């Protein structure tokens, strides 16, 4: 099972991807995911227990979380795989991904409501049930809140960091993870969420299908870093309170350890990598 660059997808592949996701929405399986992510993003704190974000397990956790989602898709169409969005290379709104036959474009100014694509509120196929405010439609504002998305140069700058993570193992940390995540440095992952706008910029970001393509790239980045730093690996290596150590099992599964997710190749591979 190969995850391809969203830019390389064929009309066929996009038809099966979009259809797979709408079924997940229709069955009620999709909302379960939005509800789970919100759970951790709203519970994870720098001062306390942190699993999904602002912590070293931000990468393995989203890797397993995405594994769940892709498998739910494969249960609707076993030919569908989760594609990534290299927002570094595909920076404008004229990217395939935002075409009406894929995710649709940005939202209208008046209220930020998405008007085209399969996930527009007018299709009736994409209602926002897991919300933070009364609005039930998909919203976006590509490049509205923030200038631009990270650049190839910037990404390489982060991938260059040899330390996976470092104490206090949070959003103040130095090292690869936190820079990838964004709370510090050039800022990659967080900014993308800010650049999309709409729900992606809120605690119910998975409401936007782009969430998975985005995180599929953050996932590919960790893999590319891993390749760059074979001598470097996951930390903490045990005993760290409130933090997920190499061999502890993360919530909500309580059956998977960051150690079980270091090598993605056990579950999938990418169309192409780097250098």
């Amino acid at each position: 099972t190969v995850r391809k660059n969203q830019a390389t997808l064929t009309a066929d592949e996009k038809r099966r991807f979009v259809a797979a996701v709408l079924e997940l929405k229709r069955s009620g399986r999709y909302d379960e995911f939005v509800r789970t992510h919100n759970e951790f993003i709203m519970s994870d704190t720098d001062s306390g227990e942190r699993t999904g974000h602002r912590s070293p397990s931000f990468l393995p956790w989203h890797r397993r979380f995405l594994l769940d989602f892709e498998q739910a898709l494969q249960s609707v169409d076993s030919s569908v795989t989760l594609p990534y969005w290299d927002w570094s290379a595909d920076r404008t709104v004229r990217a395939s991904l935002w075409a009406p036959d894929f995710l649709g474009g940005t939202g209208r100014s008046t209220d930020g409501r998405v008007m085209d694509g399969p996930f527009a509120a007018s299709t009736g196929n994409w209602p926002i049930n897991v919300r933070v405010d009364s609005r039930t439609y998909l919203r976006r504002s590509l490049g509205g809140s923030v200038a631009e998305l990270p650049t190839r140069a910037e990404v390489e700058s982060v991938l260059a960091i040899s330390a996976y993570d470092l104490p206090p193992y949070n959003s103040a940390s130095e090292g690869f993870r936190n820079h990838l995540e964004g709370w510090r440095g050039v800022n990659l992952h967080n900014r993308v969420h800010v650049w999309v706008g709409g729900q992606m910029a809120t605690g119910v970001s998975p409401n936007d299908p782009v969430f998975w393509l985005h995180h599929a790239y953050v996932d590919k980045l960790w893999a590319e870093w891993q390749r760059r730093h074979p001598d470097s690996a996951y930390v903490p290596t045990g005993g760290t309170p409130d933090v997920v150590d190499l061999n502890e099992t993360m919530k909500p599964w309580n059956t998977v350890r960051p150690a079980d997710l270091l090598d993605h190749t056990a579950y999938y591979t990418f169309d192409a990598l780097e250098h």
Partner: protein
Amino acid sequence: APESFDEVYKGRRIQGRPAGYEVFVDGVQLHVMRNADGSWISVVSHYDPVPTPRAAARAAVDELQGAPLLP
């Protein structure tokens, strides 16, 4: 540490105070979160840290576009 407040912003009453800080927009609580460096974020803008819970409250009122928060 952060100073409390209570003002009308773009038609809606933003206000918050220490609980460890609580923020509400038009009577409804807007879950906010403070980062290690003392900056803040909220359920309505979780990836864009701002200096204070007042700033975080104003970011929300803006993005909310008149929409009320859910309890």
